[PDB]
């Protein structure tokens, strides 16, 4: 619960000569999967440092790469308007999704659902079925494309953080919440461990980093902010609750890993991450390991204290 | 068609590499047969930004990737301006150029083609930047061949046409000695197999063939020194008459 | 049969182009008055009969006084004679 | 904010007692002088002046008064005759010109609107056109503001008009008001770092002498646009201000640092010779001495790029992160591959300091194809700022420019969207959108784009939109303040030209909002240096070494800064630089020959270097690979010959 990480990472895989765009940890194995810019995915251990397998198949950068509830199928998703659903332990791709007009930003999936979110560099999220790959459903309504998405962890609502300087959420429009100046740039539900201690730093309750050198914890339900986190250096690719509930993880293109405690509006750590911009970010659910994903083709893990 | 002398050769290379699309100042019109015949094959077109399907044309123009040759550039719509600044966006496997009524699939390759027919053109600000000029001026030797060439066709028939053929004699035999030099090349990239010493003898008679040219070149030294002694006077005073 | 129109109005510009048209399907004699107070006429007149076939026996004649208000392209293309 | 001083109070009191009567005023100084700020300290003395800034150009018509007049008054049939008051009952209507005397002169010496305004002062009324109406007036009064007829933009004005209006001279606050007036303000700003409090004094005084240095050389006489009234030392301390607000500590070196910076990005960021700049940069450095006997170090440079905080940066972590954006910009906007070098970073931190500050319009000159466009395209992408621009064709007239300038308008106030006006010279042949420019220019809101139905449409629009925002309006006059507030928060027009010296004053003319409501930027033309630059870093790609080439005696340098030894690699860039230098003489003997010219400007040399590239390419790949074949036939020749 008290996961912040100490000064050193242990080890990185090193093997990419292309950037990273995205970095997730598997739920149940001790590994970790990084998508890179050269139409790859690369799966190896975190408590060694030492390759294990690659996902291919890809014709142009691959943006994003997750897990369901245990890895098993994986979903990964490419700018060459496809995405891919893989077997996690073949390494396989089982599926291919086309349906779109543009690139694609980034995927998610629900851990224990049948279902796929697609943010599409076309103004729209396309809803597929896992099964059959058949774009369900499709939400549109914005000005400028989709940077991120992410679904509701009880599958009733889905947030859009956009290009619009706005954030939504949306029925499976609910609504439209706007409180940056840049385009914020990622979001994170938040979990039900902080829900008594975000009452005491003043839902449903969201997060959204922006281009504007901000965080910003808003409310489904007032559509007004709470919380505004202010001292980025710039822009903010990644912003995740802790497991605990009382800490805000989140990254930015400064070479800086910023550790928030919300209670107190103080930044508990500042770690110096990368040498370049970090591009993506992520936390294990349970092992004390955090992944940031860099411009400097590199995947640093550090363990947590 | 394109003429005989270093100017116009210059500016055909202009027609040919480039980075900028090119804008040619034609005073009388023989640059837009030049570029009639040197991109016949692949239909190109021609308009002028004053014709009303201009756009049409442009649109055809970018998706199959036809060449286009544009005329009267002085009253220039400037929505071309995008495609000179080769500013485009690509999305996967389809590239699009923006166009302000809307961005518009475009192939690799397409050529479009600035014209101008008075030299005098002080052309808008967007073009003393975006392309890059084209002279097809007329100089002395090319006025003097000219004039050499319609006084020996209107005169005497024999002469001219006798120089003619003897010149593309001329020139045919130095292409085969130097594709048959090429070609001796390309089979040396003897004693291995008799194929090889087959085509070789063919080859030393078609060196042979060239001793055809050795004795040719003497024939048109007899046709060019007739017009040559004959014919000083009217081309030095046709080419100082036109440009004083 | 030559046909006499003048410069100036709207409507006599849209007349000389119609007589302009017929001349040349027709071949007859077409003859404009002191042509030089429109120079986009001028242009206009002189860009569309460098393009276009006439018929024998058509000639059209300009009228004009000496002036920097004609553009060179008519200067250039046309036979010129001084009074 | 206005600091009390002699004049302030005199002309202020004196205002007051002509206005109280109604009578007409008309305030006669140089440009920014503080006649409007004077003329709207002494207006709240009395609470039923509601003043409307008018705004005229040298394309002034009655009817920029008339409609003015239907958006802020209403007429009505009185038993004797017809009256025109303003629709707030109990209250005046001050129409406060600003340039009475720029309008041009008929061919027959008489301006049209002057003897509008006479008629209107004179009768107390107008001829209403639409059937030729008498209609009087209730409760408006004419006041303006003015330059003398001795600037060349200005007229006199015919006598029949002047007696009507009474003149107040107006002059610059001078050397006392100037020192009083910015010592205060230097005392106030230094207590965000109470350490400076001290040095409030020196500062102030130095800040003066500059500028007084600075405003006797550089005139009119040499350029149309050398405008340096005491308005832009307002922005100065404004700046030095907003570099000091968020620290809250700093030495007094930063102080003199941002206080320098300052000095660079209002001053040298209009002139048009190297000489003058290098004056301008040495006089920096004197006073700077002078006034306090890092921030010593020539290339001084801040950002609001790197970190949270406006802090001093160095040069070359700049062009990294600016190389990882041009990364970034390439992926999502357009595939642009450009060139840049040591002048494009202070282009773009000059476009993003303007950016910042509220009602940060632009104009920039500069050689046509030199970058302008596209570093303004890229920094308003860096900062949020969409970007729209004049999708310029055949047959676009008044009509199309003000539709467009309606809907932009439209989206910009009326969703907060951050919007930045692409404005070139391919759009400034029609008079009536160079006075539209003027007018939104001026105040951000032009008096006659939206009109009836399409007013309507514009007011349920504001409606919703503050609503979202979270200002309650029930009625449409104070609706349409707040999208006033909003376009002049928002929006951020620029303006493009080359340094055609008549051109400049031909704007300035048709357009003196062009050099009151916005910075001006001189590009000129990419330097020597900055050239070398481009063509060394372009020409990398390229086997370009020679190991033994020698350096002749003398050299015909054309960049300056070579290495004593120039290596091969330097030299034939120099030689690529010399190219372009070349057709600068041929051009200018060509026109002392009464020849005709053409341009020559960057993206001919961007055309220069990549033939360059690609002929060297070739020709090194013929020459192999003929040389591979010579050798092979001459392989196989020897071997069959020895066989
Ligand atoms: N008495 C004064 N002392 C110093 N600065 C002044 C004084 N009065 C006005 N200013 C400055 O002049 C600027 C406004 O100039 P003004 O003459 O109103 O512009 P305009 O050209 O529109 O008339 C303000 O920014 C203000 O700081
Ligand atoms: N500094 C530069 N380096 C490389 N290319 C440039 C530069 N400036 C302009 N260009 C080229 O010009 C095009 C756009 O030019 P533009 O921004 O309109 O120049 P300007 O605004 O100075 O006329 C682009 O396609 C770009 O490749």
């Not at chain 3, 410069?7 to 000389?16: K, L, P, T, V």
């Not at chain 4, 015919?158 to 100037?178: E, I, K, N, T």
């Not at chain 4, 004197?286 to 940066?313: C, E």
């Not at chain 4, 992160?321 to 494009?344: Q, T």
Request: hydrophobic letters at 40%; one cysteine or more.
């Amino acid at each position: 619960k008290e996961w912040i990480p100490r000064p050193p990472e242990k080890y990185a895989l090193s093997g990419h000569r292309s950037p990273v765009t995205r970095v997730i940890f598997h739920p149940v194995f001790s590994v970790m999967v990084s998508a890179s810019e050269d139409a790859t995915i690369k799966v190896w251990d975190y408590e060694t440092g030492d390759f294990e397998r690659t996902l291919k198949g890809h014709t142009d950068s691959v943006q994003d790469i997750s897990f369901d509830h245990s890895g098993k199928l994986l979903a990964s998703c490419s700018a060459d308007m496809t995405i891919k659903l893989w077997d996690f332990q073949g390494f396989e791709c089982i599926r291919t999704m086309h349906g779109h007009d543009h690139n694609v930003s980034s995927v998610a999936i629900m851990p224990n659902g049948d279902h796929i979110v697609s943010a599409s560099r076309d103004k729209t999220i396309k809803m597929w079925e896992v099964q059959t790959g058949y774009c369900v459903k499709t939400f549109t309504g914005h000005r400028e494309w989709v940077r991120m998405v992410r679904p509701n962890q009880d599958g009733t609502l889905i947030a859009s953080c956009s290009n619009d300087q706005t954030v939504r959420v949306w029925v499976v429009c609910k609504a439209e919440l706007r409180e940056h100046e840049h385009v914020v740039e990622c979001i994170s539900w938040a979990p039900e461990s902080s829900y008594s201690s975000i009452s005491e730093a003043t839902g449903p309750f969201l997060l959204s980093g922006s281009r504007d050198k901000t965080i910003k914890m808003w409310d489904v339900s007032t559509g007004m902010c709470l919380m505004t986190l202010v001292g980025h250096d710039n822009w903010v690719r990644g912003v995740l609750f802790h497991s605990g509930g009382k800490f805000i993880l989140s990254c930015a293109d400064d070479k800086t890993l910023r550790v928030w405690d919300y209670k107190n509006k103080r930044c508990m750590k500042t770690l110096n991450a990368h040498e370049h911009f970090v591009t993506s970010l992520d936390f294990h659910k349970t092992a004390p390991y955090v992944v940031t994903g860099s411009v400097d083709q590199t995947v640093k893990v550090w363990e947590c204290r | 068609s394109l003429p005989a002398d270093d100017l116009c050769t210059e500016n055909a290379i202009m027609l040919k590499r480039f980075n900028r699309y090119p804008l040619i100042i034609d005073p009388s019109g023989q640059a837009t047969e030049f570029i009639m015949n040197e991109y016949k094959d692949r239909k190109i077109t021609r308009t002028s930004f004053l014709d009303d399907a201009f756009r049409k044309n442009l649109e055809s123009a970018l998706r199959f990737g036809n060449p286009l040759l544009v005329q009267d550039v002085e009253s220039y719509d400037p929505v071309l301006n995008p495609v000179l600044n080769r500013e485009v966006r690509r999305t996967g496997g389809r590239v699009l150029i923006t166009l302000g009524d809307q961005d518009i699939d475009l192939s690799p390759s397409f050529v479009i083609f600035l014209s101008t027919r008075d030299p005098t053109v002080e052309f808008p600000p967007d073009l003393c930047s975006r392309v890059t000029f084209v002279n097809f001026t007329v100089t002395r030797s090319s006025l003097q061949s000219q004039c050499l060439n319609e006084v020996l066709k209107a005169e005497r028939p024999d002469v001219d046409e006798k120089r003619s053929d003897l010149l593309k004699l001329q020139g045919e035999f130095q292409l085969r000695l130097r594709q048959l030099e090429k070609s001796l090349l390309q089979a040396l990239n003897i004693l291995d197999d008799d194929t090889i010493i087959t085509t070789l003898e063919n080859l030393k008679r078609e060196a042979a063939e060239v001793t055809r040219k050795v004795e040719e070149t003497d024939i048109v030294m007899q046709e060019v020194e007739t017009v040559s002694q004959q014919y000083l006077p009217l081309s030095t005073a046709c080419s100082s008459i036109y440009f004083t | 049969q030559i046909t006499s129109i003048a410069i100036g109005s709207a409507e006599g510009f849209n007349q000389a182009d119609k007589a302009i048209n017929t001349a040349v399907k027709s071949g007859r004699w077409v003859m404009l008055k002191n042509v030089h107070l429109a120079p986009g006429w001028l242009m206009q007149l002189e860009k569309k009969l460098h393009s276009l076939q006439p018929h024998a026996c058509f000639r059209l004649f300009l009228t004009m006084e000496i002036n920097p208000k004609v553009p060179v392209n008519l200067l250039r293309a046309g036979r010129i004679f001084v009074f | 904010v206005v600091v009390p001083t002699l004049d302030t109070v005199r002309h202020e009191a004196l205002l007051y007692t002509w206005l109280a009567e109604h009578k007409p005023l008309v305030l006669c100084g140089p440009p920014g002088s503080g006649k409007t700020m004077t003329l709207f300290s002494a207006l709240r003395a009395l609470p039923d002046m509601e003043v409307v800034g008018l705004n005229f150009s040298s394309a002034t018509t009655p009817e920029l008064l008339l409609k003015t007049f239907d958006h802020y008054c209403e007429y009505r049939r009185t038993p004797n005759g017809v009256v025109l008051a303003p629709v707030q009952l109990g209250k005046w209507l001050v129409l406060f010109c600003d340039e009475i005397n720029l309008p041009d002169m008929d061919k027959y010496g008489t301006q049209r609107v002057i003897s509008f305004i006479r008629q209107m002062v004179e009768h107390g009324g107008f001829y209403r056109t639409s059937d030729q109406t008498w209609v009087k007036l209730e409760r408006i009064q004419f006041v303006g503001a003015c330059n003398p007829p001795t600037d060349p933009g200005r007229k006199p004005l015919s006598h029949r008009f002047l007696r009507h209006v009474p003149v107040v001279y107006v002059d610059y606050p001078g050397p006392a008001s100037l020192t009083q007036i910015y010592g205060t303000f230097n005392r106030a700003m230094l207590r965000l770092i109470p350490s400076l409090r001290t040095y409030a004094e020196p500062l102030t005084a130095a800040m003066v002498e500059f500028y007084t240095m600075s405003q006797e050389r550089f005139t009119q006489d040499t350029q149309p646009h050398y405008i340096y009234s005491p308005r832009e030392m307002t922005r100065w301390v404004r700046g030095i201000f907003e570099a000091l607000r968020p620290l809250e500590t700093l030495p007094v070196e930063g102080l003199i640092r941002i206080w320098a910076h300052e000095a660079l990005r209002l001053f040298q960021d209009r002139l048009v010779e190297d000489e003058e700049r290098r004056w301008t940069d040495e006089n920096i450095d004197t006073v700077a001495l002078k006034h306090f006997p890092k921030a010593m170090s020539r290339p001084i440079l801040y950002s609001n790029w790197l970190s949270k905080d406006y802090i001093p940066v160095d040069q070359e972590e700049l062009r990294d992160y600016v190389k990882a954006r041009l990364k970034v910009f390439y992926e999502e906007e357009l595939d642009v591959p450009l060139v840049l070098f040591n002048e494009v970073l202070d282009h773009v931190l000059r476009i993003d300091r303007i950016f910042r500050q509220p009602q940060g319009h632009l104009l920039l000159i500069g050689v046509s194809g030199a970058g302008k466009t596209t570093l303004s395209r890229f920094v308003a992408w860096m900062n949020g700022l969409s970007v729209y621009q004049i999708k310029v064709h055949r047959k676009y007239t008044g009509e199309d420019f003000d539709e467009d300038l309606r809907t932009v308008l439209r989206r910009s106030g009326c969703k907060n969207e951050k919007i930045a006006f692409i404005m070139d010279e391919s759009n400034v042949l029609d008079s009536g959108f160079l006075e539209r420019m003027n007018t939104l220019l001026a105040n951000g809101e032009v008096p006659g784009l939206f009109e009836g139905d399409e007013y309507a449409t514009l007011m349920t629009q504001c409606k919703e939109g503050a609503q979202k925002e979270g200002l309650m309006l029930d009625s449409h006059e104070e609706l349409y303040k707040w999208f006033t507030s909003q376009v002049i928060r928002n929006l951020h027009v620029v303006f493009t030209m080359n340094p055609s010296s008549e051109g400049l004053k031909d704007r300035a003319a048709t357009s003196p909002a062009l050099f009151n409501r916005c910075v001006l930027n001189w590009f000129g033309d990419w330097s020597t240096e900055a050239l070398y630059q481009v063509g060394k870093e372009f020409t990398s790609k390229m086997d370009l070494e020679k190991p033994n080439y020698i350096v002749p005696d003398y050299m015909p340098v054309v960049y300056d800064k070579l290495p004593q030894p120039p290596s091969h690699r330097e030299a034939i860039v120099n030689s690529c630089v010399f190219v372009h230098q070349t057709l600068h003489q041929a051009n200018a003997r060509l026109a002392k020959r009464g020849g005709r010219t053409m341009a020559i400007t960057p993206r001919h040399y961007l055309d220069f270097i990549n033939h360059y590239a690609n002929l060297f390419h070739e020709k090194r790949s013929e020459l192999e690979e003929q040389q591979m074949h010579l050798n092979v036939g001459l392989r196989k020749i020897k071997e069959t010959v020895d066989q």
